[PDB]
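ZP: hey, is the 8TJ complex queued? I don't see it on the tracker
AM: it wasn't, my bad. submitting now with these inputs:
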Amino acid sequence: SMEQVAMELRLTELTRLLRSVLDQLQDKDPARIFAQPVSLKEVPDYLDHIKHPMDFATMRKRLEAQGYKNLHEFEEDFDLIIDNCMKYNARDTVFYRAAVRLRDQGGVVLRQARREVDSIG
Ligand SMILES: CNC(=O)c1cc2cccnc2s1
């Protein structure tokens, strides 16, 4: 149907917008602390603490599979990256502090993304 194609075009475009957001958010992590899953080889007990791990590579995988249906689902995953890190790591660590900075600097990007999604539809 022509309708299904139109939906696919929108989802493709949402994916295009979300890819730009993802790139902008990952740019705020030059230390690449959040680039990859927390290694279960280095942190064997990680899953005893964190029940839903997340990272930018995992987000990117879901993104290119067009697995984000709206901005809210994308934001939930971003929030997981930050919130997991701020629970697993203590307040006076490079890890916790990086998450705080990512959350603060990411808010600006996400603020405009929300306006743009509504605006463009
Ligand atoms: C977002 N990253 C993290 O939360 C952590 C990474 C590592 C690496 C070695 C030991 N502990 C940790 S905790």
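AM: back. The helical segments are 2-26, 46-49, 56-64, 71-88, 94-120.
ZP: great, adding it to the tracker
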